[PDB]
């Protein structure tokens, strides 16, 4: 009954980051899912839920470079893929892990 | 003549994070360097400089889980290894990429 | 039809900050409202809405010192009242201004 | 022998914020100092030091609205004056309180 969700805010304009590609994958393995955020900078279905969600480490790859490119911007951006590693210990908990994005800085947190 | 440096601040106590292990590696490759921060949460020599520093993507692995463990704390911490991917376009520039750390959230930025 | 809301996350434990007192006031004036966050670190009714919400500057006073005290902590905390000034230009917009809190650092943003 | 310093980073471009006006004042009182950051987003002399630095609360007013205006931008910016309240308990300590700035979000912390 666990759940893993995320949301992206573009601090450069104060609006959610729409159409940003996000990749999910277990630590060590390769991509298992690829999603694109909607207009509220979220995704309809949880990135992980039910059986899918198992205790262990994961990595989310936020394609920030592409997002900011479609908004402007260097040919070789400082931030290309924002990588976020974290561990989900409880398989039945609700994990909200938002991302606050700027061209040269970001904030990751266990939201509510 | 380029340079890559970093520094860690523990927002939980307002002091620099001392003795935190940091791993550096080119995107795709495995670890190339392993360092431990001093008492000011920095390292004597730049993580990258001179020939070592070449245009491309890198990843720094901050061992936050171990750091907070030695300071407290769950057996399976939410944040184990804080992964930071970024691209260094100019081989002759000075890149300062600090990390502001908390048990359930962190901030990455291109400092000065 | 405008709306102003906020939410507090305690990055020290990854849970919303419950029962934190928040003060609202127009720039220059004294407090106009005093609220305490619920268990999700939010408040039932918007801090501002309808006629109440008028174009101009405001200030929110998050009583962080008291919150962390009830959770531990210095007699004279570094952060006592986290002050957040901002301007609401459009009286009919929806403003979400969350606060990510830690004992020695915080993040303010125009969320969604 | 205490010291209070600060530094501003513009996360929108990864460069320090130059020529930003900063106001200092004791809680309750009006401005006591007004400074403008140099090209490294800092100021030559500490904002507070020696006798000047006394245990108590202070407030720094970062004129972000003007800074971003000279860089672009709404006539009525969301962030006009970023207000930062904090308490200095020890008169002989070194307090570094940097600001990570973006148009719609900022991070305040007790740096090193």
Curated annotation (Swiss-Prot), chains A, B, C, D:
<dbReference type="InterPro" id="IPR036817">
    <property type="entry name" value="Transthyretin/HIU_hydrolase_sf"/>
</dbReference>
<feature type="binding site">
    <location>
        <position position="7"/>
    </location>
    <ligand>
        <name>substrate</name>
    </ligand>
</feature>
<dbReference type="GO" id="GO:0042802">
    <property type="term" value="F:identical protein binding"/>
</dbReference>
<dbReference type="InterPro" id="IPR023418">
    <property type="entry name" value="Thyroxine_BS"/>
</dbReference>
<dbReference type="GO" id="GO:0033971">
    <property type="term" value="F:hydroxyisourate hydrolase activity"/>
</dbReference>
<dbReference type="InterPro" id="IPR023419">
    <property type="entry name" value="Transthyretin_CS"/>
</dbReference>
<dbReference type="Pfam" id="PF00576">
    <property type="entry name" value="Transthyretin"/>
</dbReference>
<comment type="pathway">
    <text>Purine metabolism; urate degradation; (S)-allantoin from urate: step 2/3.</text>
</comment>
<comment type="subunit">
    <text>Homotetramer.</text>
</comment>
<dbReference type="InterPro" id="IPR023416">
    <property type="entry name" value="Transthyretin/HIU_hydrolase_d"/>
</dbReference>
<keyword id="KW-0378">Hydrolase</keyword>
<comment type="similarity">
    <text>Belongs to the transthyretin family. 5-hydroxyisourate hydrolase subfamily.</text>
</comment>
<feature type="binding site">
    <location>
        <position position="109"/>
    </location>
    <ligand>
        <name>substrate</name>
    </ligand>
</feature>
<keyword id="KW-0659">Purine metabolism</keyword>
<dbReference type="InterPro" id="IPR000895">
    <property type="entry name" value="Transthyretin/HIU_hydrolase"/>
</dbReference>
<dbReference type="InterPro" id="IPR014306">
    <property type="entry name" value="Hydroxyisourate_hydrolase"/>
</dbReference>
<feature type="binding site">
    <location>
        <position position="42"/>
    </location>
    <ligand>
        <name>substrate</name>
    </ligand>
</feature>
<dbReference type="GO" id="GO:0006144">
    <property type="term" value="P:purine nucleobase metabolic process"/>
</dbReference>
<protein>
    <recommendedName>
        <fullName>5-hydroxyisourate hydrolase</fullName>
        <ecNumber>3.5.2.17</ecNumber>
    </recommendedName>
</protein>
<dbReference type="GO" id="GO:0019628">
    <property type="term" value="P:urate catabolic process"/>
</dbReference>
<comment type="function">
    <text>Catalyzes the hydrolysis of 5-hydroxyisourate (HIU) to 2-oxo-4-hydroxy-4-carboxy-5-ureidoimidazoline (OHCU).</text>
</comment>
């Amino acid at each position: 009954m666990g759940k893993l969700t995320t949301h992206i805010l573009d601090l450069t304009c104060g609006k959610p980051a729409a159409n940003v590609k996000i990749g999910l994958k277990r630590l060590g393995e390769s991509i298992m899912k690829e999603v694109y955020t909607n207009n509220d900078g979220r995704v309809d279905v949880p990135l992980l839920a039910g059986e899918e969600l198992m205790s262990g480490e994961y990595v989310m790859e936020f394609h920030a470079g592409d997002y900011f490119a479609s908004k402007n911007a260097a040919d070789q951006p400082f931030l290309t893929i924002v990588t976020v590693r974290f561990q989900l210990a409880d398989p039945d908990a609700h994990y909200h892990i938002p991302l606050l994005l700027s061209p040269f800085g970001y904030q990751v947190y266990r939201g509510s």
